[PDB]
Each structure stands twice: as structure tokens, then as C-alpha cells.
Amino acid sequence: MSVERGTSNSASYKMFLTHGGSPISYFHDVPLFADATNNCYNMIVEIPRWTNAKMEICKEELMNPIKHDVKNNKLRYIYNVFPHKGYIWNYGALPQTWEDPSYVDEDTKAKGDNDPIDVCEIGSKIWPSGSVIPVKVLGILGMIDEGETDWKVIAINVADPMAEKLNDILDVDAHMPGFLKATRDWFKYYKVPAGKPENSFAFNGEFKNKEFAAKIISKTHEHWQKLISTKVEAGPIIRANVTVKGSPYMVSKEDFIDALQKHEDFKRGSEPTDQAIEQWHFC
Amino acid sequence: MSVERGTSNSASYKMFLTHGGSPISYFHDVPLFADATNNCYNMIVEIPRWTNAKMEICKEELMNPIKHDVKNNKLRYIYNVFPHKGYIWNYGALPQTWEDPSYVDEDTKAKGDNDPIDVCEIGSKIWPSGSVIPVKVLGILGMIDEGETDWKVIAINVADPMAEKLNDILDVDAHMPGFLKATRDWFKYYKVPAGKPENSFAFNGEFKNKEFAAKIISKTHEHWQKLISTKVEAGPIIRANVTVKGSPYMVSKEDFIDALQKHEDFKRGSEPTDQAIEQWHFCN
Ligand SMILES: [Co+2]
Ligand SMILES: [Co+2]
Ligand SMILES: [Co+2]
Ligand SMILES: [Co+2]
Ligand SMILES: [Co+2]
Ligand SMILES: [Co+2]
Ligand SMILES: [Co+2]
Ligand SMILES: [Co+2]
């Protein structure tokens, strides 16, 4: 169960995860694997398909709620780059992973974007923000965002009917012609209508298969494990707090169990809508 | 002002147009020109951009309300055909026009689809169903929809900031690269997930400029003028009815306001849908 606080469509909006009416961290307290190494991962859905609001798990706040990303001091909405409407997958991230910013990847030759590893979920169901769902990984794209390592995992909700026919990245291309290309294009151009340069990619933009994913994911999990393990070491501004026992059990940054500070601002529905939710950009 | 009755997301949903608390016909009573042969047309918006529900003016019901299309005894929803999400324009129609089903067009060599002429409005704003919008025409696509003439006007809302950097169809291609092709693709494949064939096109798919467009529109207007022109001829099923106390000239099908007298159902809010409002279908 997830719960909401503050006023929606504003900076004061926060969404926390709970278990048993008791808050846990989206970042740290959700296991990376839903089911063993039977290649079933937990995905945190930040952004529903065909939506424009850039929701993110917040690293800088206690319990790591999902909140609106902000730019300029305004709520951030991504652009519609023709022919796409908003995010064209359910977009989010794998818990207990970290794109380490002091670590250079030999294949992107860049450092990490300081956030959990990103996921694009491609099932037909539109998942609401804050959902936690089990996914099979199919492959991965080596995005170099604004000069930072920004791997994008390709995955599908394991209860989707296509999950059976889709076992590796090649299957995706056979059943979804044009989909992989549109996906590269999306990440390539999506900041151009903000005046930002085109993004680039590792391996000349080649989607790598599910075996090369898993390995990359496991690496980001090790970094997360190091960030949490102990490393009693200031990784500026990320709050590493985590709860119950175990969860994570070894961590120095553990505590138990907050509850009290989960008292921020009772929720309130609000004035919706603002920016370029509506406009088409041609890039 | 538009006014609603019946239960939404159901077959009993009906949206009527009124002026001054008095209903008028979406089909017959909204003038085709918002501003004479000063370049400007009225468009009835049936379908907001990026929605899937197929709303349309009802032709067979008094006052011609907008309602859900229905096939196989359930509400009709359009497929998402990759990479598009529902309708990729505000979709609708020009009032007082008619693709005459007894009329064969020299360029499509086919008869009309018995509906008013269709419009794709391409401005930024997403318009709710039932809106009536002043638009400038930029071009036309000669679509043959399952064998019926089904011209699709390309137009833009005159208050959109693009409204004229865009003066003709060639300007659309310049500022919106890919848009025209994606638009023909949409109409080509949109019934393929239903098992139906690909649609085809007049002039091998060519978008014709606005001068050609306005010519076709006039023709569809002259047909509507014949349908309504007191023409005492039973091509109904279509209700040619008009109003008001000074609306459609001296159409035989005008009346007083028996239209107000039609009280029905009263509005009601209802459960959402499910089907494949969500699903992606893939056809090149
Ligand atoms: Co970020
Ligand atoms: Co992210
Ligand atoms: Co990024
Ligand atoms: Co990232
Ligand atoms: Co029709
Ligand atoms: Co129509
Ligand atoms: Co049609
Ligand atoms: Co039609």
C-alpha cells in the first residue's frame, strides 16, 4: 500500500510506500528481486505510460518519497516529441540499485547519474505512479544522458500475456516492429525542445540482450550495497535511511521504526495542469 | 453551450448543443462558415486528441446529439496503432455538409459515407467533445474508408499561434515534418486490428492543397443543401430537422421548438471503461 501527503500537482506533493500501515523507503526497503534469481525483479513505477509529469523517487528526503521533479523552481513536465505522447512506457526504476557517480563505465566512458537504474516497462497495462510490480528484464540500452551513464532497462510485467512470447530483446523486435528504434529516438531527442543537445549511446545505440542486462543491474546493485552496506561515508545529500530488521539489517543507516515523522501535511486535491502537457514538438 | 443527458460511458449518453438554453442541431443549425468567404469554417469537435472513444453526431435522432458509436452491441473504441495514441488530431466534422451516398466522386470513383465531411484539427489545444471551433482549412486527404468516399479535411484553429505560419498544406509539411505521412498511416491501418482491410486513397495518397479542399467542402455543402433544401425526398433514417424561428431558411424540415420539449434522462456520472484503450497494436 502507498499513501499521499501534501497538495497534488505541487512541490509539496509526496507519495510514500507502506507495509502494514507502516512506512518503508522506496529506494532502500524494496527488494531488487521479487523472486530469487528466477529473473523476476521489483520495479517501482514512477511515471504511467502517456503521462508527462516527471515523478522521481526522492533521494534527499527521509523515506525517499516519490515527488515531482522541479526545474527552474517550477514543476517539470517532459515534452511530447512527435510522434510520441509523453513517456511511451511505464517508466521507473529498480530498488536497491545505484548509478554510482564516482564510477566510470568502460562502455559509456562516463560516470553515473547518481540515481537508481532506470526501467522502461512495456506491457499494455498502464501502471499508476507508486506501483511496485514484478518484471522480467529483456534487454538494456546504454544511454549517455547529459554526459552521464544512464542505462535504461527494458522489461515487462510478468503477468502481461506477451511476457510468455517475449523472452529476450530480439523477441521484442519481432513482435513490436519499430518499438526499439522509437525508444532510442525518445531518449535521443527528449531534451532538444529545452535547448539541450541530443543525447548519445553506448555501442552505437545497440540494445544489448537480457544477459548483458542482469549483469549491469547486478553491478548497480553492488554499488547500492556499498552505498548502504556501511560505507560510513558522506555521499553528499542522499538519505540512506532504511527500516525494520532485516531491511537492510546490515546497514549503519538503519533505524526502526520512524512512523512519527510521517506527519508532513495531510493530502489535498488541487489545481491540475500547467506546461507543455499538450504541445507537439518536431525534432 | 453544450448540454448533456443520460449516463456517460454508456449508449444512453447524449450531448446536445444549445443557444440561450434552447437546443439546436449540431448537424443542421451550426453555419458552415463562421465568417463568410472570409476564409473561416465552423468545426464541431467530436473527438479530443489522444482519446479513443468514437463520438459522433447521431444523424438518426432529433437534434442530432453527439453520442458513442456502437458496434456489436458495445461502445466503439479506436485502437492504438503504433506509434500513435488514439486520435492524433482533434477529430470531428463540418456542419451542414454531406458525403452523399448516391454520389460517385470522379477521383475516388466511389460513393459517400453518408456523414458530414470529416476534419482533422491540428492545433496544440486539446478540445473537449462538443466544442464548436473556427478553423482555417489547409488541405484534404482523399481517403476511401472501406470503399466509401471519406475525405478528411486538414485544418487548424484560427487562434492557435501556428494558425498562420501555416497558410497551405505545404507549410504543414515544412513545420511539422512526418505529420502528413503519419496522418495517412493512421487512416490506412486503423481498422487492421479489427480484421478489416487497409484503407486506400485518392491520388495515390497525395494531400491536396486548401484550394482543392475548399472546392470539395463546397460540394459537400451543396449536397447538404439539397438534403435539407425542403427536398421532400425520403433518404432518411437521417432526421433532416432544423429549427429555429429563423434557422435553416425554408427547409420543409424546419420546426418551432419541439426541441426544448425533448426532456430526457438527466445527466449521470458512470464507471470508466476497459478493452484496449491501453493496448498497442503493430502494423508498419
Ligand atoms: Co534524474
Ligand atoms: Co531515474
Ligand atoms: Co536520465
Ligand atoms: Co537515470
Ligand atoms: Co461514421
Ligand atoms: Co465522421
Ligand atoms: Co471514416
Ligand atoms: Co466520415
Side-chain angles (χ1 to χ4, degrees), chain A residues 38-54:
Chain A
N38 155 285
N39 322 86
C40 189
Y41 298 84
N42 280 311
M43 169 187 178
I44 296 167
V45 182
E46 289 168 325
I47 299 186
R49 183 169 78 260
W50 291 329
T51 266
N52 296 66
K54 172 59 162 152

PDB file of all heavy atoms in Angstrom, chain A residues 38-54:
ATOM      1  N   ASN A  38      15.349 -16.140 -10.244  1.00  0.00           N
ATOM      2  CA  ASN A  38      14.500 -16.573 -11.345  1.00  0.00           C
ATOM      3  C   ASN A  38      14.006 -15.356 -12.134  1.00  0.00           C
ATOM      4  O   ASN A  38      12.911 -15.269 -12.678  1.00  0.00           O
ATOM      5  CB  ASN A  38      13.428 -17.554 -10.815  1.00  0.00           C
ATOM      6  CG  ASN A  38      12.174 -17.601 -11.667  1.00  0.00           C
ATOM      7  OD1 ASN A  38      11.390 -16.702 -11.623  1.00  0.00           O
ATOM      8  ND2 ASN A  38      12.137 -18.528 -12.625  1.00  0.00           N
ATOM      9  N   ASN A  39      14.961 -14.436 -12.196  1.00  0.00           N
ATOM     10  CA  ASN A  39      14.970 -13.272 -13.061  1.00  0.00           C
ATOM     11  C   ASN A  39      13.672 -12.500 -13.011  1.00  0.00           C
ATOM     12  O   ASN A  39      13.171 -12.004 -14.025  1.00  0.00           O
ATOM     13  CB  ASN A  39      15.286 -13.681 -14.500  1.00  0.00           C
ATOM     14  CG  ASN A  39      16.325 -14.776 -14.574  1.00  0.00           C
ATOM     15  OD1 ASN A  39      15.994 -15.958 -14.499  1.00  0.00           O
ATOM     16  ND2 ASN A  39      17.592 -14.392 -14.705  1.00  0.00           N
ATOM     17  N   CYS A  40      13.152 -12.394 -11.800  1.00  0.00           N
ATOM     18  CA  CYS A  40      11.987 -11.584 -11.538  1.00  0.00           C
ATOM     19  C   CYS A  40      12.368 -10.435 -10.606  1.00  0.00           C
ATOM     20  O   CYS A  40      12.694 -10.647  -9.440  1.00  0.00           O
ATOM     21  CB  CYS A  40      10.885 -12.442 -10.930  1.00  0.00           C
ATOM     22  SG  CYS A  40       9.322 -11.593 -10.802  1.00  0.00           S
ATOM     23  N   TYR A  41      12.337  -9.225 -11.145  1.00  0.00           N
ATOM     24  CA  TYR A  41      12.728  -8.017 -10.427  1.00  0.00           C
ATOM     25  C   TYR A  41      11.525  -7.219  -9.953  1.00  0.00           C
ATOM     26  O   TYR A  41      10.444  -7.318 -10.528  1.00  0.00           O
ATOM     27  CB  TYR A  41      13.578  -7.121 -11.321  1.00  0.00           C
ATOM     28  CG  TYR A  41      14.871  -7.743 -11.763  1.00  0.00           C
ATOM     29  CD1 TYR A  41      14.930  -8.587 -12.872  1.00  0.00           C
ATOM     30  CD2 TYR A  41      16.042  -7.479 -11.071  1.00  0.00           C
ATOM     31  CE1 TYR A  41      16.123  -9.145 -13.263  1.00  0.00           C
ATOM     32  CE2 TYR A  41      17.224  -8.019 -11.452  1.00  0.00           C
ATOM     33  CZ  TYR A  41      17.266  -8.853 -12.542  1.00  0.00           C
ATOM     34  OH  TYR A  41      18.469  -9.382 -12.891  1.00  0.00           O
ATOM     35  N   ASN A  42      11.725  -6.420  -8.915  1.00  0.00           N
ATOM     36  CA  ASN A  42      10.708  -5.472  -8.472  1.00  0.00           C
ATOM     37  C   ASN A  42      10.913  -4.168  -9.194  1.00  0.00           C
ATOM     38  O   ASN A  42      12.010  -3.622  -9.197  1.00  0.00           O
ATOM     39  CB  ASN A  42      10.770  -5.242  -6.959  1.00  0.00           C
ATOM     40  CG  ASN A  42      10.086  -6.360  -6.168  1.00  0.00           C
ATOM     41  OD1 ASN A  42       8.961  -6.745  -6.472  1.00  0.00           O
ATOM     42  ND2 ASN A  42      10.779  -6.893  -5.162  1.00  0.00           N
ATOM     43  N   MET A  43       9.870  -3.657  -9.823  1.00  0.00           N
ATOM     44  CA  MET A  43      10.006  -2.333 -10.391  1.00  0.00           C
ATOM     45  C   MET A  43       9.175  -1.329  -9.593  1.00  0.00           C
ATOM     46  O   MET A  43       8.037  -1.608  -9.211  1.00  0.00           O
ATOM     47  CB  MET A  43       9.603  -2.339 -11.863  1.00  0.00           C
ATOM     48  CG  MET A  43       9.468  -0.942 -12.476  1.00  0.00           C
ATOM     49  SD  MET A  43       8.806  -0.931 -14.142  1.00  0.00           S
ATOM     50  CE  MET A  43       8.732   0.826 -14.469  1.00  0.00           C
ATOM     51  N   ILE A  44       9.755  -0.165  -9.331  1.00  0.00           N
ATOM     52  CA  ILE A  44       8.977   0.941  -8.810  1.00  0.00           C
ATOM     53  C   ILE A  44       8.538   1.800  -9.988  1.00  0.00           C
ATOM     54  O   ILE A  44       9.376   2.347 -10.717  1.00  0.00           O
ATOM     55  CB  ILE A  44       9.770   1.745  -7.806  1.00  0.00           C
ATOM     56  CG1 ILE A  44      10.090   0.848  -6.609  1.00  0.00           C
ATOM     57  CG2 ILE A  44       9.005   3.014  -7.390  1.00  0.00           C
ATOM     58  CD1 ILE A  44      11.118   1.430  -5.724  1.00  0.00           C
ATOM     59  N   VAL A  45       7.226   1.871 -10.204  1.00  0.00           N
ATOM     60  CA  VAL A  45       6.689   2.691 -11.267  1.00  0.00           C
ATOM     61  C   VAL A  45       6.597   4.138 -10.811  1.00  0.00           C
ATOM     62  O   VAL A  45       5.833   4.475  -9.896  1.00  0.00           O
ATOM     63  CB  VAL A  45       5.302   2.202 -11.720  1.00  0.00           C
ATOM     64  CG1 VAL A  45       4.792   3.056 -12.889  1.00  0.00           C
ATOM     65  CG2 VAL A  45       5.375   0.748 -12.129  1.00  0.00           C
ATOM     66  N   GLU A  46       7.391   4.994 -11.449  1.00  0.00           N
ATOM     67  CA  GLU A  46       7.359   6.425 -11.152  1.00  0.00           C
ATOM     68  C   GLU A  46       6.363   7.163 -12.049  1.00  0.00           C
ATOM     69  O   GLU A  46       5.680   8.070 -11.595  1.00  0.00           O
ATOM     70  CB  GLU A  46       8.760   7.035 -11.298  1.00  0.00           C
ATOM     71  CG  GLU A  46       9.768   6.616 -10.197  1.00  0.00           C
ATOM     72  CD  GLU A  46      11.222   6.995 -10.530  1.00  0.00           C
ATOM     73  OE1 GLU A  46      11.585   6.952 -11.720  1.00  0.00           O
ATOM     74  OE2 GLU A  46      12.001   7.340  -9.598  1.00  0.00           O
ATOM     75  N   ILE A  47       6.267   6.753 -13.312  1.00  0.00           N
ATOM     76  CA  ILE A  47       5.583   7.529 -14.346  1.00  0.00           C
ATOM     77  C   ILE A  47       4.725   6.613 -15.240  1.00  0.00           C
ATOM     78  O   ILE A  47       5.271   5.802 -16.005  1.00  0.00           O
ATOM     79  CB  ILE A  47       6.626   8.295 -15.234  1.00  0.00           C
ATOM     80  CG1 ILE A  47       7.456   9.282 -14.401  1.00  0.00           C
ATOM     81  CG2 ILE A  47       5.975   8.987 -16.425  1.00  0.00           C
ATOM     82  CD1 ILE A  47       8.412  10.175 -15.223  1.00  0.00           C
ATOM     83  N   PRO A  48       3.385   6.724 -15.148  1.00  0.00           N
ATOM     84  CA  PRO A  48       2.461   5.996 -16.042  1.00  0.00           C
ATOM     85  C   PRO A  48       2.693   6.294 -17.553  1.00  0.00           C
ATOM     86  O   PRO A  48       3.115   7.389 -17.915  1.00  0.00           O
ATOM     87  CB  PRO A  48       1.076   6.493 -15.605  1.00  0.00           C
ATOM     88  CG  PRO A  48       1.253   7.015 -14.239  1.00  0.00           C
ATOM     89  CD  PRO A  48       2.660   7.573 -14.185  1.00  0.00           C
ATOM     90  N   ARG A  49       2.457   5.305 -18.410  1.00  0.00           N
ATOM     91  CA  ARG A  49       2.610   5.483 -19.852  1.00  0.00           C
ATOM     92  C   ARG A  49       1.669   6.592 -20.322  1.00  0.00           C
ATOM     93  O   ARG A  49       0.540   6.671 -19.829  1.00  0.00           O
ATOM     94  CB  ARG A  49       2.332   4.158 -20.599  1.00  0.00           C
ATOM     95  CG  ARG A  49       2.546   4.234 -22.124  1.00  0.00           C
ATOM     96  CD  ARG A  49       2.541   2.858 -22.817  1.00  0.00           C
ATOM     97  NE  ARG A  49       1.196   2.308 -23.006  1.00  0.00           N
ATOM     98  CZ  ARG A  49       0.637   1.378 -22.227  1.00  0.00           C
ATOM     99  NH1 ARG A  49       1.291   0.865 -21.174  1.00  0.00           N
ATOM    100  NH2 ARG A  49      -0.579   0.952 -22.507  1.00  0.00           N
ATOM    101  N   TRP A  50       2.164   7.464 -21.216  1.00  0.00           N
ATOM    102  CA  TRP A  50       1.365   8.507 -21.897  1.00  0.00           C
ATOM    103  C   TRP A  50       1.066   9.689 -20.963  1.00  0.00           C
ATOM    104  O   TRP A  50       0.179  10.511 -21.201  1.00  0.00           O
ATOM    105  CB  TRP A  50       0.068   7.898 -22.489  1.00  0.00           C
ATOM    106  CG  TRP A  50       0.373   6.967 -23.662  1.00  0.00           C
ATOM    107  CD1 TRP A  50       1.414   7.082 -24.543  1.00  0.00           C
ATOM    108  CD2 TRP A  50      -0.355   5.785 -24.057  1.00  0.00           C
ATOM    109  NE1 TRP A  50       1.379   6.046 -25.464  1.00  0.00           N
ATOM    110  CE2 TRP A  50       0.297   5.249 -25.196  1.00  0.00           C
ATOM    111  CE3 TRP A  50      -1.497   5.140 -23.568  1.00  0.00           C
ATOM    112  CZ2 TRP A  50      -0.148   4.092 -25.840  1.00  0.00           C
ATOM    113  CZ3 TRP A  50      -1.948   3.995 -24.218  1.00  0.00           C
ATOM    114  CH2 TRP A  50      -1.272   3.484 -25.341  1.00  0.00           C
ATOM    115  N   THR A  51       1.863   9.766 -19.912  1.00  0.00           N
ATOM    116  CA  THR A  51       1.847  10.836 -18.915  1.00  0.00           C
ATOM    117  C   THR A  51       3.041  11.777 -19.176  1.00  0.00           C
ATOM    118  O   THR A  51       3.980  11.394 -19.904  1.00  0.00           O
ATOM    119  CB  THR A  51       1.865  10.176 -17.511  1.00  0.00           C
ATOM    120  OG1 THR A  51       0.514  10.036 -17.052  1.00  0.00           O
ATOM    121  CG2 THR A  51       2.736  10.888 -16.496  1.00  0.00           C
ATOM    122  N   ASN A  52       3.003  13.006 -18.648  1.00  0.00           N
ATOM    123  CA  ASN A  52       4.112  13.947 -18.861  1.00  0.00           C
ATOM    124  C   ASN A  52       4.811  14.446 -17.608  1.00  0.00           C
ATOM    125  O   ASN A  52       5.905  15.005 -17.699  1.00  0.00           O
ATOM    126  CB  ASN A  52       3.625  15.158 -19.652  1.00  0.00           C
ATOM    127  CG  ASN A  52       3.166  14.784 -21.036  1.00  0.00           C
ATOM    128  OD1 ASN A  52       2.177  14.087 -21.180  1.00  0.00           O
ATOM    129  ND2 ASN A  52       3.890  15.238 -22.063  1.00  0.00           N
ATOM    130  N   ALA A  53       4.191  14.257 -16.444  1.00  0.00           N
ATOM    131  CA  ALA A  53       4.789  14.740 -15.204  1.00  0.00           C
ATOM    132  C   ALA A  53       5.985  13.872 -14.832  1.00  0.00           C
ATOM    133  O   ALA A  53       5.883  12.644 -14.772  1.00  0.00           O
ATOM    134  CB  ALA A  53       3.769  14.761 -14.089  1.00  0.00           C
ATOM    135  N   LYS A  54       7.131  14.512 -14.626  1.00  0.00           N
ATOM    136  CA  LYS A  54       8.343  13.792 -14.262  1.00  0.00           C
ATOM    137  C   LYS A  54       8.391  13.557 -12.744  1.00  0.00           C
ATOM    138  O   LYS A  54       8.877  14.394 -11.991  1.00  0.00           O
ATOM    139  CB  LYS A  54       9.584  14.551 -14.756  1.00  0.00           C
ATOM    140  CG  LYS A  54      10.961  14.015 -14.284  1.00  0.00           C
ATOM    141  CD  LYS A  54      11.212  12.594 -14.685  1.00  0.00           C
ATOM    142  CE  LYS A  54      12.694  12.243 -14.604  1.00  0.00           C
ATOM    143  NZ  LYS A  54      12.930  10.780 -14.323  1.00  0.00           N
TER     144      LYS A  54
END
